[PDB]
């Protein structure tokens, strides 16, 4: 259940030259490449150790691809600005997310592309990968446009063939890191917040991939869990905690339940004093 | 790797 995905971001800065443009490539939950046009002669560069052995033919191609996308996304920012009847003074954010997924058998499973203007779903590619769903009535003009040019055709060819082929190449090149299942190191911490209440915080540290399920249960049978967003440790692994407010003295009634690919069976924790 | 074509809206 692997994937190769890219996240493109274009930001119009009127009167301060061409827009800001950034591409980042991810295999599963590991960034491996990046492009930033905010530099003189900007280039696609390796951002995983296992990507530095690729030839300059690769980087030259990726550079040109990312450069042409920046150029197209500049035009797109002009066009969309025109559709929403917005000013040439405001800064506007076009976001593009595309990727392919491999099944259990390791063959193509599914592809997706989505556009967003000012952080809002704009134009989604359908699961048939041959047509678009304009989420907004402003995106209808775009939908009609991308169908006239048979734009989905070329995206299908990338998502079905090229994307899957290179996902396989990356999974081999970076296999020592990418195919390693680091399970969470898990524990419970008690934080008194008042006379009557305390906080049980269930930790999961240095786990990969990022997908993890943390839930609190009570012997018998609970308050609604505080669940912080999954954060990077900065070493390729991830951290996450789930917290629950409980009456003080009644902490050993609550169990934490962790689920991760790197765990054969789900782990149960309980706070001991 | 990146797709060669970027859709024009």
């Amino acid at each position, epitope marked *: 259940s692997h994937s190769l995905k890219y996240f493109h971001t274009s930001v119009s800065r009127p009167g301060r030259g061409e827009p800001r443009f950034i591409s980042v490539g991810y295999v599963d939950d590991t960034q491996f490449v990046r492009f930033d046009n905010d530099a003189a002669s900007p280039r696609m560069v390796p951002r995983a150790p296992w990507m530095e052995q690729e030839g300059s033919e690769y980087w030259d191609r990726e550079t040109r691809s990312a450069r*042409d996308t920046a*150029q197209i996304f500049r035009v797109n920012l*002009r066009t969309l600005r025109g559709y929403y009847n917005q000013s040439e003074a405001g800064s506007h954010t076009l976001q593009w997310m595309h990727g392919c997924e491999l099944g259990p058998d390791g063959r193509f499973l599914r592809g997706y592309e989505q556009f967003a203007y000012d952080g809002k779903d704009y134009l989604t590619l359908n699961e048939d990968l041959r047509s678009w769903t304009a989420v907004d009535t402003a995106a209808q003009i775009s939908e009609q*446009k991308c169908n*006239d*040019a*048979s734009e989905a*055709e070329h995206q299908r060819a990338y998502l079905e063939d090229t994307c899957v082929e290179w996902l396989h190449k990356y999974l081999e090149k970076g296999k020592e890191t990418l195919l390693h299942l680091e399970p969470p190191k898990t524990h419970v911490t008690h934080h008194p917040i008042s006379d009557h209440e305390a906080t049980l915080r269930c930790w999961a540290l240095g786990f990969y991939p990022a997908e993890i399920t943390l839930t609190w249960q009570q012997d018998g049978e609970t308050q609604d869990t505080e669940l912080v967003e999954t954060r990077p440790a900065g070493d390729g692994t991830f951290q996450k905690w789930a917290a629950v407010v409980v009456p003080s003295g009644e902490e050993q009634r609550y169990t934490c339940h962790v689920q991760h690919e790197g765990l054969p069976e789900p782990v149960t924790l309980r706070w001991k004093p | 790797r990146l797709p*060669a074509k970027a859709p*024009l809206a």
Partner: T-cell receptor
Framework: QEVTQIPAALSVPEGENLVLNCSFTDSAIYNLQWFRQDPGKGLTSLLL?????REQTSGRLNASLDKSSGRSTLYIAASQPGDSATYLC???????????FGKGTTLSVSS | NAGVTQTPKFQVLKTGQSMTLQCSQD?????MSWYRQDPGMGLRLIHY???????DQGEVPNGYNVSRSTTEDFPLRLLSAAPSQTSVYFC??????????????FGPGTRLTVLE
């Protein structure tokens, strides 16, 4: 992208049928376009075939597109002296931002 | 309407001299291209534009500059004329590259000869 036109020069008697060929390395194209050039003049578009389209017919000219094969065939039915000119082939480049052209086939329809 | 207009039609340059090949279209075409044509080499994309203030280089861009200040005009500047740049230069525009309305229109062409 590279576009090749086979042959480079063609000389056929008037009244005869003839094929101008054009093949391209990259199949992922939007449009293929055939052009005419008279000596010391510019290019005038003859036919435009979309990626989705298969045929485009204009009188005695029929251009065909096989995206898979990566070739287009321009059929000139019952040739006339007035056809004597240079014919060029062009597809949308990798980026899809400008047309990339072949050397072109220099046609001479002898009277 | 005039289609695509080019000036001059013929020009002679001494090596090192600079000049601007003028090109304009009154068809409001967002896409404009500059090509050179020399025997058995075909049409070689020098520079291309996808709108006002957006420029990029093609197959053989070395020796030339371009500006797309306006939708209407796409001048080509030879910075330092060389014998190798002796060719016939064609300016071209189209409403679309990827769309159904992709008819590309060319200028009458500029014959340039550079001499020592």
């Amino acid at each position: 992208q590279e576009v090749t036109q086979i042959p480079a020069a063609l000389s056929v008697p008037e009244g005869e049928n003839l094929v101008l060929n054009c093949s391209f390395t990259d199949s992922a194209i939007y449009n293929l376009q055939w052009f005419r050039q008279d000596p010391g003049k510019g290019l005038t578009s003859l036919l435009l075939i979309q990626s989705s389209q298969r045929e485009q017919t204009s009188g005695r000219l029929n251009a065909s597109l096989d995206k898979s094969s990566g070739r287009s065939t321009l059929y000139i039915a019952a040739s006339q002296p007035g056809d004597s000119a240079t014919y060029l082939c062009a597809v949308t480049n990798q980026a899809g931002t400008a047309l990339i052209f072949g050397k072109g086939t220099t046609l001479s329809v002898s009277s | 309407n005039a289609g695509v207009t080019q000036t001059p039609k013929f020009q002679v340059l001494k090596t090192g001299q600079s000049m601007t090949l003028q090109c304009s279209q009154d068809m409001n075409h967002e896409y404009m291209s500059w090509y050179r044509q020399d025997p058995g080499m075909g049409l070689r994309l020098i520079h291309y534009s996808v709108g006002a203030g957006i420029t990029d280089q093609g197959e053989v861009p070395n020796g030339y500059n371009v500006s797309r200040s306006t939708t209407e005009d796409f001048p080509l500047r030879l910075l330092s004329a060389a014998p190798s740049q002796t060719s016939v230069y064609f300016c071209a525009s189209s409403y679309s590259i990827r769309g159904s309305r992709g008819e590309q229109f060319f200028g009458p062409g500029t014959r340039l000869t550079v001499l020592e």
